Design an enzyme around this catalytic site. Structure first.
Site, PDB file in Angstrom:
ATOM      1  N   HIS A 255       3.838  11.095   6.218  1.00 45.44           N
ATOM      2  CA  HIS A 255       3.312  10.803   7.545  1.00 45.44           C
ATOM      3  C   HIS A 255       4.423  10.205   8.410  1.00 45.44           C
ATOM      4  O   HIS A 255       4.900   9.104   8.124  1.00 45.44           O
ATOM      5  CB  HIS A 255       2.152   9.805   7.492  1.00 45.44           C
TER       6      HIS A 255
ATOM      7  N   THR B 107      -5.474   6.671   8.336  1.00 43.48           N
ATOM      8  CA  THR B 107      -6.091   6.865   7.028  1.00 43.48           C
ATOM      9  C   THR B 107      -6.130   5.588   6.172  1.00 43.48           C
ATOM     10  O   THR B 107      -6.608   5.633   5.041  1.00 43.48           O
ATOM     11  CB  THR B 107      -5.435   7.992   6.219  1.00 43.48           C
ATOM     12  N   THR B 108      -5.630   4.484   6.734  1.00 44.96           N
ATOM     13  CA  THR B 108      -5.749   3.161   6.119  1.00 44.96           C
ATOM     14  C   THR B 108      -6.478   2.252   7.114  1.00 44.96           C
ATOM     15  O   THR B 108      -6.387   2.426   8.322  1.00 44.96           O
ATOM     16  CB  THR B 108      -4.378   2.553   5.813  1.00 44.96           C
TER      17      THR B 108
ATOM     18  N   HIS C 186       0.793  -1.234   0.000  1.00 46.10           N
ATOM     19  CA  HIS C 186       0.000   0.000   0.000  1.00 46.10           C
ATOM     20  C   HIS C 186       0.823   1.281   0.000  1.00 46.10           C
ATOM     21  O   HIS C 186       0.329   2.335  -0.370  1.00 46.10           O
ATOM     22  CB  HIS C 186      -1.186   0.019   0.995  1.00 46.10           C
TER      23      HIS C 186
ATOM     24  N   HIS D  74       1.999   9.148   0.860  1.00 47.94           N
ATOM     25  CA  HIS D  74       0.886   8.946  -0.059  1.00 47.94           C
ATOM     26  C   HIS D  74       1.145   9.856  -1.251  1.00 47.94           C
ATOM     27  O   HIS D  74       1.581  10.992  -1.058  1.00 47.94           O
ATOM     28  CB  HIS D  74      -0.456   9.305   0.595  1.00 47.94           C
TER      29      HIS D  74
ATOM     30  N   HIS E 161       6.014   7.069   6.103  1.00 49.87           N
ATOM     31  CA  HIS E 161       5.616   6.647   4.763  1.00 49.87           C
ATOM     32  C   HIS E 161       4.991   7.853   4.068  1.00 49.87           C
ATOM     33  O   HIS E 161       4.780   8.905   4.691  1.00 49.87           O
ATOM     34  CB  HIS E 161       4.625   5.472   4.816  1.00 49.87           C
TER      35      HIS E 161
ATOM     36  N   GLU F 135      -3.478  13.515   1.174  1.00 49.42           N
ATOM     37  CA  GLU F 135      -4.666  13.052   1.878  1.00 49.42           C
ATOM     38  C   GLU F 135      -5.400  14.272   2.481  1.00 49.42           C
ATOM     39  O   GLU F 135      -6.551  14.560   2.144  1.00 49.42           O
ATOM     40  CB  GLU F 135      -4.278  12.014   2.918  1.00 49.42           C
TER      41      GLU F 135
HETATM   42 ZN    ZN Z   1      -0.327   7.699   5.962  1.00 51.90          ZN
END
Ligand code: ZN
Length: 257
Positions: A116, A195-196, A61, A93, A91, A103
């Site tokens: 993040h 957020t996951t 992901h 996005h 990590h 995000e």
């Molecule tokens: Zn994140």
């Protein structure tokens, strides 16, 4: 299993994770005019001088840069936080195009990517226990825009070829996350969630106002990663962002005027 495709993306997550429609979901749009300056907030304390990175992992992901969190080595404190929060991983996005990928949004503006830095509250002993608490995590969010290169990001970019596919990891020692920070620590803060999946409502979000700039070549390398495992059909790891969720009964506070 959940993901970011048409058939398993964010609009489907609620079926397996009903908290997806909860009262404190993330990310959110940050409406800058409605956020209120809170003079009682304290400066952030980001103490990363003793950080010990260990490994980088493609988890299908995103990719996580993982740290030794068995001692107070890299910690976040101050700001809205009570106590000490230990860095466990960071990590990103990112998008398929420079006009999307973040995000959080700022007055509906989407950035090219979002970093993040994930920290857990030491009063709960371990990350797994912390995510079960409303004040278990503190996530420092940093926007990325495309322009000049970020020199401190290049070591990350250059290892990505070795973790192209899901489940691959590589040694990643001696990486200094201070090289990913902007100049200013001015921020917005609000209570939210992962957020996951599992989307747990355990996060104090601290979103920096100042983005960092990365080059087009750097983000292009993020977009060469794969969601799939080795020996499976290639699906580029792009657009691994959840869109903004309803603010509901929350106020976003600003550290700055
Ligand atoms: Zn994140």
């Amino acid at each position: 299993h959940w993901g970011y495709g048409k058939h398993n993306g964010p609009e489907h997550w609620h079926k397996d994770f009903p908290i997806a429609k909860g009262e404190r979901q993330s990310p959110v749009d940050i409406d800058t005019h409605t956020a209120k300056y809170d003079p009682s907030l304290k400066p952030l304390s980001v103490s990363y001088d003793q950080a010990t990175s260990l490994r980088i992992l493609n988890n299908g992901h995103a990719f996580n840069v993982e740290f030794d969190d068995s001692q107070d080595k890299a910690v976040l404190k101050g700001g809205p936080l009570d106590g000490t929060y230990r860095l466990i991983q960071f990590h990103f996005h990112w998008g398929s195009l420079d006009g999307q990928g973040s995000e959080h949004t700022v007055d509906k503006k989407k950035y090219a990517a979002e970093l993040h830095l994930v920290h857990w509250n030491t009063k709960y002993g371990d990350f797994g226990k912390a995510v079960q608490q409303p004040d278990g995590l503190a996530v420092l969010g940093i926007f990325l825009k495309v322009g000049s290169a970020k020199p401190g990001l290049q070591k990350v970019v250059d290892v990505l070829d070795s973790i192209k596919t899901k489940g691959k990891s590589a040694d990643f020692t001696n990486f200094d996350p201070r090289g990913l920070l902007p100049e200013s620590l001015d921020y917005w803060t609000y209570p939210g969630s992962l957020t996951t999946p599992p989307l747990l409502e355990c996060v104090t979000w601290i979103v920096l106002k100042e983005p960092i700039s990365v080059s087009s070549e750097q983000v292009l390398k993020f977009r060469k990663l794969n969601f799939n495992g080795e020996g499976e059909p290639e699906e580029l790891m792009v657009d691994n962002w959840r869109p903004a969720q309803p603010l509901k009964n929350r106020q976003i506070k600003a550290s700055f005027k």
